[PDB]
Structure prediction request, 512 residues.
Amino acid sequence: STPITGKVTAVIGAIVDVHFEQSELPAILNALEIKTPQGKLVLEVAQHLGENTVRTIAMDGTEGLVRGEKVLDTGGPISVPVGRETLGRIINVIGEPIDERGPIKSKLRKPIHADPPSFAEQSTSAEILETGIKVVDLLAPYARGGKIGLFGGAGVGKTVFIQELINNIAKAHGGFSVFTGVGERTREGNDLYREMKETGVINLEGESKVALVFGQMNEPPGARARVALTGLTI
Amino acid sequence: SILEERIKGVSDEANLNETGRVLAVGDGIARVFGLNNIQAEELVEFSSGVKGMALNLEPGQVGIVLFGSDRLVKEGELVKRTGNIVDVPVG
Amino acid sequence: PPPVRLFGVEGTYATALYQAAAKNSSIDAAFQSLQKVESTVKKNPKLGHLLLNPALSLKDRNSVIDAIVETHKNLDGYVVNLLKVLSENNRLGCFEKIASDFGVLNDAHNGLLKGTVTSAEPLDPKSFKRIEKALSASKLVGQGKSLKLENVVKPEIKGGLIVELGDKTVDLSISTKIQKLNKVLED
Prediction:
């Protein structure tokens, strides 16, 4: 209700410690917003350290933080927006519409911290995806609902391999896709955006069978960590 | 006198050997003030229902290791001492 | 610099109190008021002898302070600032620590010296008095410096004696001589 007021105590890189009002500590994994001259800096509560002094991780740059700067409390895990109109949007870590096709048309929001499914729920399939790529088809067939893993070194066209997969399976399949880029270069990003705009998988009026979460390596390491979490929730 | 009475009033007056209160919780390492009757690695139940073992018994605090998820634990939490060291059904 | 540099563990607080109230010149007064509240703390058993150790809030700590200064209407004002400091730093375990340390500094201002005459068992008062006289007579105790001498029972040392004061000691013990004798007959 009343946002718990916090005062910054220590800016020590990404770690920013806040001194929330007595007898009320925003719980671990909550989301704090500090209105800043550059948007709202989101701080994810990651420890309680005592006497209503928390130690939180920043999700945006830490320049121009003035000690004892009022910190509003959202009150809960960073909640992105989800919908079917999230498809064909570029959505940043804290759920901003960096699609640049203006504000995402939120249906529902969900937290980016969620407990993984139970053993009982998980049902193990055994059906075969096929990419038409000879090596893949013969020597390592892929399987529906799989967890395929492209282990390789530096710049083995890692992105290129993924692009080939997107070209074949994604365009072909009727299901949705989620393209998540964690610390992808903005060179690679622009190419991906353009490429999937071109292939029309992002159709600028039409429906998109993919959503985008392009995480840029310039974004703070903390923000980089929760690019993944955002993608998972979508 | 009246001060002492008011002091008693603002004090929890917890048994505080059964009966712990989290001092600080970070990284799944709750550090509890109380639990003087604790036996090492003994099962303790938080008021979040989280269960833990007490791998570190230290003079000032007892470092419970949470078996649950950290997001459900928050400071000052009563920690009743289940009082039975980790045991599992056998049969 | 102010007499006696202790600089203990949170004894920098004691030092601060000493020098600050020394220039107020109300160190005896401060010490007395601190003693009076310390005694009523010791005679407060639930809390401050059972929550001497913290687990309290800032606000609750402050409210514990307010009750403490409610008990005394004579409490100086430098030690009311010291109480504030202790509340703010949320240390209460170093309340008696500071009391002892401020006491050492205070009794240094007084010029009282301390000593100890450990023995196996507690001894005659006639011996105590003769030794107290002797120690005061000796240059070991300076003039304008008082002597407090405490005989202690240290059955850990069997027989022998050690006179101690001003960190300068004369140890005429049985144990060391026995040790030396033994050693020399192991030669």
